[PDB]
Design a protein around this nucleic acid. Sequence first.
DNA 1: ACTGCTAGAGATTTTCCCG
DNA 2: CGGGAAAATCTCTAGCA
DNA 3: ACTGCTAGAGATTTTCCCG
DNA 4: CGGGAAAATCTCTAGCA
Lengths: 47, 47, 261, 242, 261, 242, 66, 66
Amino acid sequence: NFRVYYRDSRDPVWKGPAKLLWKGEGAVVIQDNSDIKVVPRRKAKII
Amino acid sequence: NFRVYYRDSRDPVWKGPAKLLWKGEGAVVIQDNSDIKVVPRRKAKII
Amino acid sequence: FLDGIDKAQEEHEKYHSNWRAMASDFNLPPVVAKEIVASCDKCQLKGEAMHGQVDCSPGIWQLDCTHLEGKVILVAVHVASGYIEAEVIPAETGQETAYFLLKLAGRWPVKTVHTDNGSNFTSTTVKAACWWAGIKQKFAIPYNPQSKGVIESMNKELKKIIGQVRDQAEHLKTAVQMAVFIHNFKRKGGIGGYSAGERIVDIIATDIQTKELQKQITKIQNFRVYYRKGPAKLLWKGEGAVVIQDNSDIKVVPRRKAKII
Amino acid sequence: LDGIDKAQEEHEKYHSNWRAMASDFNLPPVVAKEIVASCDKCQSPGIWQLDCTHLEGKVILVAVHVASGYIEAEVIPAETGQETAYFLLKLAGRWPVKTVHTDNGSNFTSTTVKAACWWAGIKQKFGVIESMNKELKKIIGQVRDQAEHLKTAVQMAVFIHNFKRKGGIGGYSAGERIVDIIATDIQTKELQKQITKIQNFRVYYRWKGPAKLLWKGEGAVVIQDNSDIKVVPRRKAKIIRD
Amino acid sequence: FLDGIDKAQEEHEKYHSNWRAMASDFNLPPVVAKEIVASCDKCQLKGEAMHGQVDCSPGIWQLDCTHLEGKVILVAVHVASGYIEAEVIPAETGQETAYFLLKLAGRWPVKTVHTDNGSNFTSTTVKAACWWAGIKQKFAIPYNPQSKGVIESMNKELKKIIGQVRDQAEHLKTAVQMAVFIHNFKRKGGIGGYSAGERIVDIIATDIQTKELQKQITKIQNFRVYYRKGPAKLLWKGEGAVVIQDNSDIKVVPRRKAKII
Amino acid sequence: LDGIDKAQEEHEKYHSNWRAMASDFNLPPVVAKEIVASCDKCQSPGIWQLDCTHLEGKVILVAVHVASGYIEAEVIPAETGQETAYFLLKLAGRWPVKTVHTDNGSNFTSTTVKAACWWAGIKQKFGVIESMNKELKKIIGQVRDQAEHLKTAVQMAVFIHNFKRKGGIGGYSAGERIVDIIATDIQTKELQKQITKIQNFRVYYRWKGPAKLLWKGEGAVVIQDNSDIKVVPRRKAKIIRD
Amino acid sequence: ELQKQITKIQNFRVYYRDSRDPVWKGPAKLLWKGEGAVVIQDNSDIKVVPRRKAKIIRDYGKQMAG
Amino acid sequence: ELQKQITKIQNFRVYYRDSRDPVWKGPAKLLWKGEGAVVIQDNSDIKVVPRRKAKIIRDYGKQMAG
DNA sequence: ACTGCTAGAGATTTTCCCG
DNA sequence: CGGGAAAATCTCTAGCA
DNA sequence: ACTGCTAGAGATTTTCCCG
DNA sequence: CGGGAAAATCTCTAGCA
Ligand SMILES: Nc1c(C(=O)NCc2ccc(F)cc2F)c(=O)n(O)c2ncc(CCCCCCO)cc12
Ligand SMILES: Nc1c(C(=O)NCc2ccc(F)cc2F)c(=O)n(O)c2ncc(CCCCCCO)cc12
Ligand SMILES: [Mg+2]
Ligand SMILES: [Mg+2]
Ligand SMILES: [Mg+2]
Ligand SMILES: [Mg+2]
Ligand SMILES: [Zn+2]
Ligand SMILES: [Zn+2]
């Protein structure tokens, strides 16, 4: 399992940790409190 | 002699040609209609 | 390190020091200090320093709206070639976008469009137009313009050309069409030293020709290859190497340890 | 290189074009063109034709690519020179348009259309359009019920004609045909460009009389002297400009 | 090329085609097409793709104002080390900036400041403060933040640290001081694996020590070197190479073809 | 390496510190410290002292670096714990401050100052300040006419004291002295860090009894066994952790 | 029959990119074209590239030069 | 006398940059320090660097490690 | 006549360590 | 010398109005 | 489950050209 | 093979809200 810390929508703040559902090249799909988000990998950190 | 085409102050337009008075590393000093300006070399082209 | 580790954890809870500082100030291995930092949610404030790569398939089009002189210009770009289409429209409406897209699909082989999540692109009218034209819709990640970087760059380029020819036209629509013409046929570069129009013609013709050629070849060439495994279909062979497709997994193998029937 | 003699023999026996012989005998297209054009016994993509039609009180401006049957049709507010000039500038920006055929109508002969053609480098000259208009009207009648407005139906008909109607020698569509024809036109223009570059050179080989230059590639230098094509190595030849 | 050149010039006057397009479409040498483009004022719309480098002398300070939570933070950075000073001020006033700068000059050896052209930095009060403190003023090119990139980056960094510790302080000034402390002594990296405070102490002490050492050496070592020329003063010698200063022009020469008296 | 024997002889004859012997005989500082600390016969930078003074009805808070004479003085709105805590947090962020000496005043003993010290890791303990205050007041009197407000005069006096007043053994200023002292403190901390890293190792050489590790450099491995420092090559030694 | 078609397919040039490289690699020679993958040869190196990272042309300037 | 001071000066490390390179070059050995120029030696290569492009330290972590 | 940088997340190359 | 793990160096990006 | 790019200004390396 | 000029390739940046 992984912890993802991200930055979704024009919010300079960073959120997380979220469950990493999917990882691609340049983007990830995560779940943060029953809300699935798609975040570019530029705006995400996976641990 | 050189022709300088530049971009000075928040104006997206490009001006010139101007007389190149001085050239340094990263900046140039030019004269455009008796008005001396200092322009970063990122915003200037010398011919 | 138990004492040093516990001291470093309190020091980080106060100051959020980086792993280098705690390693230097508590005699910690870099792994342990990195673990201390990595377990603090307040320090996870940076993403990985890379970039993705947009789709460049031959049927890929990127659409966007730009604004010039108080008017709206709807711009499409063919990603493979850089060939652009642009039209000045009265408003950023769904019907206007659907009409533009129907025209584009009727003039060129458009298989999918990549747009951001502006209200016009997400309208039901554009969805119906795409359904009728057989176009798939790929929406970018919200507030991520880089996802459509090509069209974004083209926006800049298009505007630049307009700025060069604005005096030659009295309306903005005529200058927009002049800029489209200039970009498509008067600017040369890129992979083939081409213009955008030459490159798009080459891309589309190459797609058709390669499809037909490979169809004929697979019709004639029919073999099964074993390697190291099951009867993988033969794809290509020669020069001591054989490319095969085993269970929809294309792989390259040396000619040694391979048999063709 | 080695296949020039076979290529000339094949041309004498069948009078084939340069593309077939260049494909068959692995010759550069310049040499094949030269041996095709050296026999006196062996001796369109940019032309569009436009017209304005009427349906349901709306004037539809239609341009046809004559070589392929490709159509660009749109509903214009009025049969006016300004709309025609805008349509033609758009078409010139979308496709390589060189000559346009019209019917001496009031719009097509206007000063605005002439100015647009002058800017876009299009030549103006004053039966395919009638058949194409009939087919377009038939398709519009077929797909009228699927659209509320006429412009959308027109665009749907253009889509169907250009990509969903297949026929002819190879069973292709109009879009496929136009892409093929423009690709051939690009090849022809590139070959002409190269001939223009190499026609200003003179080669002295083995020294013998001045000869024209055909190819300067990886293997050797192919020239033509006294209506006879020869191949010589670099050090046995001298290429100059006159 | 006269005919092709004249045709290309008219084609460019209409379309502003790039040199590649005109070379391809009029059979022109790349030099001639590049000359055609280079003589059109309407096509000069791009500068050279480089960057400068800010001054990094030991007496160099970069000052700026940033805004957080509706308050103004005046920030100085020592460019050589990255050591920062910051203070929350009631307003972006010239007297406030002059007071900040007098404090900085009284606490550290400040020889010149590099600021943008904001109204406070260009005030007469700051000029008088710099004159009294013996500080030279270097103003950046207007609307060019990159000229003070260091402090700009520090701004971001400072704000980041504030965002990490904002809950530990009730006022913003206390959180600003906490961030300054953390940056100066709790973050390690850079050239010496240092903190900013350690690095600034090292830089200043090294400057003093090297100055005194070189003064003593030049007091003892006294020679004139001829090479290839006049009596250049000897600066350094050894390993088959001699560095000399001839007419205020420091140059390196091999030990061969050089005589020392 | 080769100079350990000479270094021990020099230390026995003069009882010199490790810095002088490490400079003279080109030894790593760890070995010099070891031979300095192996003889029983041979056996400040972070302390600041603060006080509030008064001038022209304004309370000036002054901190002095005891080792160097460096001063940080500023005019505070009121002699209150909050201003003292803000001043001390600033000073801790500007310099390495470890211990602070105060005079049991109402502000210095407040909970806000204690909390600030706890956050900044400063220890609180309850004659240099009187002389320093006298000198600061003298300088302020000298430069009062050059400033309208008292805070500016205070800062000008701080500037003059820290950089424009030169005296002492070497004729330095207070800023030079404080930078030198903090640089020495950084060196001392680094040496202690390295000793802490290498004190947990045990070396078996030539195998003989366990020995402590001193240096593992480019040449060989320097260890200490039975109060006698030896040098052995790598393959003749084994370094483990206990 | 088959050999002529094979050579015709190898006459096509491919410009491709890798997963983490933003620079388009030079004109490799096309060997096989699939629905989602393309098999190319780049300087005696056989690679398999996703279709989304491949631009397949012919380069008409060059076909007509040899 | 002079030799001790010379070695002491060479004990200082210099991090420098060139005119068009944005990357700081590694810790060269200091040979001479002037008002506006610094003479350094970087891997058997003697260079002259402007003072505005040179950070001269001592690296105390390393002086105290040998 | 002045001038992008900085610090962190990965990726790749160097170096130390024992046989 | 052979790997292998740890350290070091290189690459690259957002945010700084 | 998605994804920075593009075109121009210099700089540096490759290639063609004649001896 | 030796330079030398021309071509080609590589590097890097602003602007795209
Ligand atoms: N735009 C300002 C920025 C700014 O864009 N930053 C972002 C930013 C962007 C790129 C970069 F590489 C570094 C950066 F930081 C900034 O940082 N500061 O500080 C500023 N300060 C003052 C004024 C207005 C000056 C008053 C008019 C003077 C005319 O002469 C503008 C700015
Ligand atoms: N910010 C927009 C930009 C934009 O910042 N460009 C600059 C830009 C910056 C970086 C880059 F790499 C490429 C770029 F181009 C842009 O270009 N376009 O087109 C936009 N279009 C629509 C909306 C708002 C969508 C409505 C809300 C949807 C929420 O789901 C915003 C934008
Ligand atoms: Mg958009
Ligand atoms: Mg956009
Ligand atoms: Mg500013
Ligand atoms: Mg700023
Ligand atoms: Zn933390
Ligand atoms: Zn132009």
